[PDB]
Write a protein that binds this DNA or RNA. Structure first.
Ligand SMILES: [Mg+2]
Ligand SMILES: [Mg+2]
Ligand SMILES: [Mg+2]
Ligand SMILES: [Mg+2]
Ligand SMILES: [Mg+2]
Ligand SMILES: [Mg+2]
Ligand SMILES: [Mg+2]
Ligand SMILES: [Mg+2]
Ligand SMILES: [Mg+2]
Ligand SMILES: [Mg+2]
Ligand SMILES: [Mg+2]
Ligand SMILES: [Mg+2]
Ligand SMILES: [Mg+2]
Ligand SMILES: [Mg+2]
Ligand SMILES: [Mg+2]
Ligand SMILES: [Mg+2]
Ligand SMILES: [Mg+2]
Ligand SMILES: [Mg+2]
Ligand SMILES: [Mg+2]
Ligand SMILES: [Mg+2]
Ligand SMILES: [Mg+2]
Ligand SMILES: [Mg+2]
Ligand SMILES: [Mg+2]
Ligand SMILES: [Mg+2]
Ligand SMILES: [Mg+2]
Ligand SMILES: [Mg+2]
Ligand SMILES: [Mg+2]
Ligand SMILES: [Mg+2]
Ligand SMILES: [Mg+2]
Ligand SMILES: [Mg+2]
Ligand SMILES: [Mg+2]
Ligand SMILES: [Mg+2]
Ligand SMILES: [Mg+2]
Ligand SMILES: [Mg+2]
Ligand SMILES: [Mg+2]
Ligand SMILES: [Mg+2]
Ligand SMILES: [Mg+2]
Ligand SMILES: [Mg+2]
Ligand SMILES: [Mg+2]
Ligand SMILES: [Mg+2]
Ligand SMILES: [Mg+2]
Ligand SMILES: [Mg+2]
Ligand SMILES: [Mg+2]
Ligand SMILES: [Mg+2]
Ligand SMILES: [Mg+2]
Ligand SMILES: [Mg+2]
Ligand SMILES: [Mg+2]
Ligand SMILES: [Mg+2]
Ligand SMILES: [Mg+2]
Ligand SMILES: [Mg+2]
Ligand SMILES: [Mg+2]
Ligand SMILES: [Mg+2]
Ligand SMILES: [Mg+2]
Ligand SMILES: [Mg+2]
Ligand SMILES: [Mg+2]
Ligand SMILES: [Mg+2]
Ligand SMILES: [Mg+2]
Ligand SMILES: [Mg+2]
Ligand SMILES: [Mg+2]
Ligand SMILES: [Mg+2]
Ligand SMILES: [Mg+2]
Ligand SMILES: [Mg+2]
Ligand SMILES: [Mg+2]
Ligand SMILES: [Mg+2]
Ligand SMILES: [Mg+2]
Ligand SMILES: [Mg+2]
Ligand SMILES: [Mg+2]
Ligand SMILES: [Mg+2]
Ligand SMILES: [Mg+2]
Ligand SMILES: [Mg+2]
Ligand SMILES: [Mg+2]
Ligand SMILES: [Mg+2]
Ligand SMILES: [Mg+2]
Ligand SMILES: [Mg+2]
Ligand SMILES: [Mg+2]
Ligand SMILES: [Mg+2]
Ligand SMILES: [Mg+2]
Ligand SMILES: [Mg+2]
Ligand SMILES: [Mg+2]
Ligand SMILES: [Mg+2]
Ligand SMILES: [Mg+2]
Ligand SMILES: [Mg+2]
Ligand SMILES: [Mg+2]
Ligand SMILES: [Mg+2]
Ligand SMILES: [Mg+2]
Ligand SMILES: [Mg+2]
Ligand SMILES: [Mg+2]
Ligand SMILES: [Mg+2]
Ligand SMILES: [Mg+2]
Ligand SMILES: [Mg+2]
Ligand SMILES: [Mg+2]
Ligand SMILES: [Mg+2]
Ligand SMILES: [Mg+2]
Ligand SMILES: [Mg+2]
Ligand SMILES: [Mg+2]
Ligand SMILES: [Mg+2]
Ligand SMILES: [Mg+2]
Ligand SMILES: [Mg+2]
Lengths: 52, 131, 386
RNA sequence: AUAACUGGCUUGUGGCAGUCAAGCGUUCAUAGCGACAUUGCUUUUUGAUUCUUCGAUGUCGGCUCUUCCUAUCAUACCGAAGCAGAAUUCGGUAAGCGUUGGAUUGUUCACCCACUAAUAGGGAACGUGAGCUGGGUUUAGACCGUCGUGAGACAGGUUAGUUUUACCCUACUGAUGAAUGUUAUCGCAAUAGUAAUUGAACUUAGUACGAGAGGAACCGUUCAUUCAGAUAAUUGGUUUUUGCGGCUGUCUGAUCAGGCAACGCCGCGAAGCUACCAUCUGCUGGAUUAUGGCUGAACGCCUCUAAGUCAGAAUCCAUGCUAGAACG
RNA sequence: UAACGAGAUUCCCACUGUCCCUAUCUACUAUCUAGCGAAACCACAGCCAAGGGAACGGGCUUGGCAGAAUCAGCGGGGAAAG
RNA sequence: GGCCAUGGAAGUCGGAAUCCGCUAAGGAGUGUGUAACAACUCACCGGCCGAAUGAACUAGCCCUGAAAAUGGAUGGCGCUCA
RNA sequence: AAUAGGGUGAAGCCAGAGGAAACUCUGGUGGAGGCUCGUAGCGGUUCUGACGUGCAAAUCGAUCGUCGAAUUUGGGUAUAGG
């Protein structure tokens, strides 16, 4: 197995937890929860989110 | 030639997906799904790797106004894999094929679901990124 | 006229009436058929549904596309402290069915099982089983006589056992008392086994092994009164329907001039007695093991409990059973685990399970840590830590 | 005392099925058909009649939902062929189990597109309006065409046109409950119900079969359709957790902290609930039908049958599952 | 026939729980209580199957059966009411 | 190995024929078998046992013919030298 | 006696440009209209929504037509059953 890391908050993604997103440019994104996913969908900046 | 697990259906009858091959079509309009049994009021629906009967709504004129087979290669509705991963793509796309599963085009733009590539060797040959 | 189009019926007629269970404790309707050649062993155990978790396991299923590849599977935790044997009942074959002949009890019963026989324990003189305890007066020949009667006349022998509910986090003090049929050996062997186990604890590891297929007896989740749309899965009427749409439009033809028993009607949903079969045993954990959640690949010293405890249950500090998938009942429900009634040789039943990893993140939210040590290592020092 | 629904008699008509066998079928009546005749069945057609209802039984169709029939479209087991294989056709036991998504049309009917194992036909007051809907028909407004001197007519076209009441009895679905000395625990099981369904891929195997072209099946293995029963790990959805944050207007002199905007709006949002939008689970023995047989007379032979007897279907009865007789 | 039209009709883009296929939430009911307290309707009444019968019975005939008192829903029947 | 058809057909693919001779026995052949014969099998006559046998028709009961929708009616139970 | 707030921008008028003339063009100004969006008002399209023993013998909610004139309206007054 392999623990994955959130492409937004950096949270640890354990097997099954969270969602996975494939963008058009084939780049893969991993979100541990809907909140990190939702912020990415709203096109925020993780550099500016105070807890990421 | 394959036995893929059940996936959450993404493309009911009436859905219009993108056409991801260089056959000259830009749309693929779903009018039926291969292997759909009988259930009152239930719409046939397709997942990635499903053969579909489709028409070309937008594309070259000689591809338009005809029923032709197509295979869904990516879907934006999230579905769960046996490894527990919920994944989804940015869009729903398909490619025109034969009844044998041989593409009308020769190249594919964008990613392809591993469910589709594992099930259709002719699309795997012509496919680029496989997720 | 006929229906315009055909469709299968909504719901099963084999689970009627859709009424509340008569008791909250699920009862074993049928026990495994007795084989004399087997050793004397129990056929059931009582536990409490703690909660659900997630595991990772390598699949051994040749011909599958996931063979030798990791799969993520839902699992259920059943808190199962050892049960205490307190009694034995004999049944006789009669032309009218099995009939209980005699019940012999142990000399000493614990307080948690003696509370079973009271509705208002705190206001009582607690007189239960005192004269029976006196039946053991200095020779206990009445007990031996009843046991000899059971040995002589009984064809079915069942033990009476109760849970040790003081070992669970439940605030309920009444134990759950049940009959568990004894299989294997002669009737004399069964009676001797039952007597020698009076007031003794029997663990799950003496009844169930890992990778076994077992059945679950339980009373399902109550939902109260429910309409036809969710009780029976009928089609919702159009949005513009007068007086509402969560109905069955036609509840019968003109003739028969009655409503048929096969028509879906609104009523009470859930809290039904269910027997669910073919649940694989992924783990028989031990309460004394400090590495319940550890596997052969994840050596993290870790209990089976998620972070913050099982939601609305607490911690599983006892022996437990980790079953594949979902089982009937709610959290804190008493669950009856029964052995399988047949021999399954399918690849699913005989597969040997070796777990890779067991999820112990919090079930109370989007937990992202398996251990407080992992949490403090990820986040570092906080203000409250000084 | 009499028409326009249903219902009743009849069955001309409609539909379906037999017999006799001149012919068809390269030969060859009956593999598959079958004229001239003739015997029937059915009441999903239309007639015939006017028995019931005119102090009113709400008259089309669709949606929803249950049940029933078999004259079986598919699925099980078999017999026959002008059955080499594959395919196909006829038949037996069979209604256990399913029989779809759409364009046009108010349609029933129809026709096209497409999937599918199949997209069989019907009944239940032409099931089903105090279940809905109201597109059609069939009040009153209005237009057109034809007819009429006209008022007006049309079984012609068109457009707009109120779909009421259940709290009673029963029935259904669930829920309490007196008395069978009291109270408590664990049970037994009469009776009633019952559940699974279908497809695909790999192997067998490019094998049997076939000149070739083509081309199976059993054991086994992995998935999928339809259905069923749970469950909430995970993911998604939901937010009066008005939990946290943000925003506008105004009010409390400002700040802090707040009030109101008929939950003010926005982002996240646990818990709870929940989704083939999520996961899990859906048992194994016997007796039989058709059918193929053994021995074996009748009838010195023959003969599955007469006595006796073997195997055997998606059938049946059990196992298993639900309720537990509130007078077991 | 430009323009106009809460007029009738067909198609396209956008948008949508109309639908696949449903799920969740809020207030007010419904529900229980104190008080208050009508009406429609009513030959007698109210469990089924077949028969015959004014040819579609709750009652008749022949069978199935049948155990006090009851609560919330429901819309098959009372060829329910109006 | 009858004639003619036939690549071949000799009884057993197909057409005129359907005879004769020996026989008590035998068809220009009732089938299986051959590319074709051959082969065996039958038609009929023998040996054997030895007392009955075959065909057509008539009408009694029973069966097939004989398919519909809630579960159900020789009135019900039930009845088989009734 | 009554009729928020906007949009559009008719004649008439001022200035400039082009042209031989006949005239044309541009920027302003002005504030027309049974014009237009839309309150009050007047009306009553759709949900064939609620209700349908109602709050009501015609109401309630949203949506909607029109809204400076063939406008709305009080009071007085006239016309009376073939
Ligand atoms: Mg439909
Ligand atoms: Mg429909
Ligand atoms: Mg059915
Ligand atoms: Mg697979
Ligand atoms: Mg007590
Ligand atoms: Mg003693
Ligand atoms: Mg215990
Ligand atoms: Mg469900
Ligand atoms: Mg309505
Ligand atoms: Mg949770
Ligand atoms: Mg955590
Ligand atoms: Mg007729
Ligand atoms: Mg006829
Ligand atoms: Mg008729
Ligand atoms: Mg009449
Ligand atoms: Mg009338
Ligand atoms: Mg009347
Ligand atoms: Mg009438
Ligand atoms: Mg009526
Ligand atoms: Mg009508
Ligand atoms: Mg039949
Ligand atoms: Mg059925
Ligand atoms: Mg279909
Ligand atoms: Mg249509
Ligand atoms: Mg249509
Ligand atoms: Mg027609
Ligand atoms: Mg009627
Ligand atoms: Mg009729
Ligand atoms: Mg009708
Ligand atoms: Mg009828
Ligand atoms: Mg009705
Ligand atoms: Mg009505
Ligand atoms: Mg109707
Ligand atoms: Mg109408
Ligand atoms: Mg109408
Ligand atoms: Mg018409
Ligand atoms: Mg009119
Ligand atoms: Mg005229
Ligand atoms: Mg007309
Ligand atoms: Mg005409
Ligand atoms: Mg109108
Ligand atoms: Mg009324
Ligand atoms: Mg009592
Ligand atoms: Mg039973
Ligand atoms: Mg089915
Ligand atoms: Mg070859
Ligand atoms: Mg094998
Ligand atoms: Mg299928
Ligand atoms: Mg289900
Ligand atoms: Mg299901
Ligand atoms: Mg969520
Ligand atoms: Mg949630
Ligand atoms: Mg202050
Ligand atoms: Mg204020
Ligand atoms: Mg299964
Ligand atoms: Mg016999
Ligand atoms: Mg009884
Ligand atoms: Mg009784
Ligand atoms: Mg009884
Ligand atoms: Mg009873
Ligand atoms: Mg009882
Ligand atoms: Mg218009
Ligand atoms: Mg208009
Ligand atoms: Mg038109
Ligand atoms: Mg037109
Ligand atoms: Mg009420
Ligand atoms: Mg009161
Ligand atoms: Mg009354
Ligand atoms: Mg009855
Ligand atoms: Mg009548
Ligand atoms: Mg009756
Ligand atoms: Mg009757
Ligand atoms: Mg009556
Ligand atoms: Mg009488
Ligand atoms: Mg009587
Ligand atoms: Mg009724
Ligand atoms: Mg009434
Ligand atoms: Mg009436
Ligand atoms: Mg016979
Ligand atoms: Mg007969
Ligand atoms: Mg006699
Ligand atoms: Mg104005
Ligand atoms: Mg305009
Ligand atoms: Mg004003
Ligand atoms: Mg107004
Ligand atoms: Mg209305
Ligand atoms: Mg509304
Ligand atoms: Mg009302
Ligand atoms: Mg609204
Ligand atoms: Mg206007
Ligand atoms: Mg105006
Ligand atoms: Mg004016
Ligand atoms: Mg005036
Ligand atoms: Mg005024
Ligand atoms: Mg007059
Ligand atoms: Mg007068
Ligand atoms: Mg007068
Ligand atoms: Mg007059």
């Amino acid at each position: 197995m392999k623990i994955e890391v959130d492409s937004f908050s950096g949270s640890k993604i354990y097997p099954g937890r969270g969602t996975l997103f494939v963008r058009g440019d084939s780049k893969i994104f991993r979100f541990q929860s809907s909140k990190s996913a939702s912020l990415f969908q709203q096109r925020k900046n993780p550099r500016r989110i105070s807890w990421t | 030639s394959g036995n893929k697990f059940r996936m959450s259906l993404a493309l009911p009858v009436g859905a219009v997906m993108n056409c991801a091959d260089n056959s000259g079509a830009r749309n693929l309009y779903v009018l039926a799904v291969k292997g759909t049994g009988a259930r009152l009021n239930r719409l046939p629906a397709a997942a990635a790797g499903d053969m579909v009967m489709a028409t070309v709504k937008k594309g070259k004129p000689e591809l338009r106004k005809k029923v032709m087979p197509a295979i869904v290669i990516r879907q934006s509705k999230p579905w769960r894999r046996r490894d527990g991963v919920y994944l989804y793509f940015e869009d729903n796309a398909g490619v025109i094929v034969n009844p044998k599963g041989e593409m009308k085009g020769s190249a594919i733009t964008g990613p392809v679901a591993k469910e589709c590539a594992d099930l259709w060797p002719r699309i795997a040959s012509n496919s680029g990124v496989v997720v | 006229s006929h229906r315009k189009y055909e469709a299968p019926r909504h719901g099963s007629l084999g689970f009627l009436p859709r009424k509340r269970a008569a008791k909250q404790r699920g009862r074993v309707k049928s026990f495994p058929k007795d084989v004399k050649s087997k050793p004397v062993a129990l056929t059931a155990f009582l536990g409490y549904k703690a909660g659900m978790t997630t595991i990772v396991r390598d699949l051994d299923r040749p011909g599958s596309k996931m063979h030798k590849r990791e799969v993520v599977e839902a699992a259920t935790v059943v808190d199962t402290p050892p049960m205490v044997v307190v009694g034995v009942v004999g049944y006789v074959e009669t032309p009218r069915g099995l009939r209980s002949l005699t019940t012999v009890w142990a000399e000493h019963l614990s307080e948690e099982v003696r509370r079973r026989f009271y509705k208002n324990w705190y206001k009582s003189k607690k007189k239960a089983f005192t004269k029976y305890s006196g039946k053991y007066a200095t020779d206990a020949k009445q007990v031996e006589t009843e046991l000899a009667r059971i040995k002589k006349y009984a064809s079915v022998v069942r033990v009476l056992a109760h849970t040790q509910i003081k070992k669970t986090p439940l605030s309920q003090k009444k134990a759950h008392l049940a009959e568990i049929q004894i299989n294997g050996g002669s009737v004399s062997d069964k009676v001797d086994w039952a007597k020698e186990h009076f007031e003794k604890e029997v663990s799950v590891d003496s009844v169930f092994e890992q990778d076994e297929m077992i059945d679950v007896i339980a009373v399902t989740k109550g939902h109260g009164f429910e309409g036809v749309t969710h009780r029976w899965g009928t089609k919702k009427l159009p949005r513009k329907t007068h007086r509402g749409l969560r109905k069955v439009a036609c509840i019968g033809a003109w003739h028969p001039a009655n409503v048929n028993w096969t028509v879906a009607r609104a009523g009470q949903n859930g809290y039904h007695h269910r027997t669910s079969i073919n649940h694989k045993v992924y783990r028989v954990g031990k309460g004394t093991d400090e590495a319940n959640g550890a596997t052969e690949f994840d050596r993290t010293k870790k209990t089976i409990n998620p972070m913050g405890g099982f939601v609305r249950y607490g911690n599983v500090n006892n022996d437990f059973v980790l079953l594949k998938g979902s089982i009937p009942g709610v959290k804190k429900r008493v669950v009856t685990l029964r052995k399988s009634l047949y021999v399954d040789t399918s690849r699913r039943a005989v597969e040997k399970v070796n777990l890779k990893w067991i999820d112990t993140a919090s079930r109370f939210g989007k937990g992202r840590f398996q251990t407080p040590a992992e949490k403090h290592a990820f986040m570092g020092t906080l203000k409250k830590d000084l």
